[PDB]
Structure formats: structure tokens, C-alpha cells
Amino acid sequence: SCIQFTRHASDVLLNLNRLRSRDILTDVVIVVSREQFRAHKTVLMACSGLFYSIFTDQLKCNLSVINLDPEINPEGFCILLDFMYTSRLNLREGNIMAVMATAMYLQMEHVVDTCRKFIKAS
Amino acid sequence: SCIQFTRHASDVLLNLNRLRSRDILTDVVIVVSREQFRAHKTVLMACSGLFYSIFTDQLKCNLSVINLDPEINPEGFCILLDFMYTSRLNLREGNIMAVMATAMYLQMEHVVDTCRKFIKAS
């Protein structure tokens, strides 16, 4: 018999993104080639099958630095990290291939699905 | 020119609640009288003006245990912690006064607003 506040989840995500922009309580650095991205492990786990696997591992859960596969494009990662914290995906003709490949590696099934649909249309 | 995934914020919150139920990456214990509640500092900050103030404080940001004011009812806190992680508020005739008082202390303005509306109706 609960009541529900419709905007609550969106408002929580907006505040987590504000914490990220101000580098508050970030507990991991994701290294993609020369580029570094600060984030919250819990947000990464909630969005990605790959980060979920990494941070539930008894040894990796304690690492402050995670290095991604050298094939991963920093721009594709940046677009996906922004999507994790906002629900908004900056999908463009010039980045769609790098975004789909990064989403497949990160195991973000809904992003992979929209990339496959957008590629099929063109 | 971004696209948006409607269910993303709700799905993120659902996964953060799953991490909470399994005690994964919880980094703080909230003590309310004899009762203890494990949570994620970032989720508490995103939902509460009080926890936002506590965990942005250069000294308190590093505490693993936070003791609430002895006037705070553990049941009222539990209902509010569940709301933070689910958007669902278990508001009942028998708990509304304890929920409103706890939401005022935690600075959760939308919960305070619905409690005032529900009390006014009765």
C-alpha cells in the first residue's frame, strides 16, 4: 500500500551526476588509453555488466584504478559514462561504431540495442 | 541532440537497492537508537539535505558510523531509507507523524510535503 514519487529516481540520478561533476565521493579512476575518468563504483555497477562483475570480485572491489582494454576509445567511454549519470546518449554518425563497441565491452544491453537499430536504419 | 532511455534512472535505482539488500559496497552505518542501517553515502546525499551536509564536510565525509539524534524513531528512518532506494513511501496512519518528523530532520522536502497534505486531509 505504498505511494510513489514519480520524479524520485531521476532526481537521485541528477544529484549523483552533480556529485560526479564536483568530484565528490568518487572512489575509482577508469583509465582508457591516456585518458582518466573519475566515477562512483556503485553507479558504474548499476549501469554496466562489466563493472558489476569487476567490483563484486573480492580482490578488484578494493582497486582505486581500473585499466580498460587498449582497443577501447576514450570518446566512446566518455559518451557512455555521461549516459550512465544522465540517461542521455550523444549518439552521432561519427561516433556510433565506437559507442556500440564500447557498450558491448561494458555490457550495457539497452545502448547496444539502440546502436544496432540506428545502424540498421542507415 | 541526445536520445534518452526513459527507464534508465529507475533501473539504476533498482540496482543500487539490490546492492544495498546484498550489503555490496555499503560504506556507512546509520545508528538510530539501538538500530543500525547500512547504506551508500552517495545515495543518502542524493536524497537528503542532512546527509548531503554531513558527507560534504571534510571531517565527517570519512566517518564509517553516523549517530542520529536520539529523538529519531528507527521505524520512521527505515521507511525513509526504503523510499530513498525505491521511490516508494510506506505512509500509514500509525507512522505518518514519525515519518514527517524524520523527513523534516533528514531534509527530504517532497516527503515532508506529502505528509503535511495527508495530515491536512484527516
Binding site: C2, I3, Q4, F5 | L89
Partner: peptide
């Protein structure tokens, strides 16, 4: 607020 809604009835979910």
C-alpha cells in the same frame, strides 16, 4: 505522488 501516485498509486504505483
Amino acid at each position: 505522488w501516485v498509486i504505483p
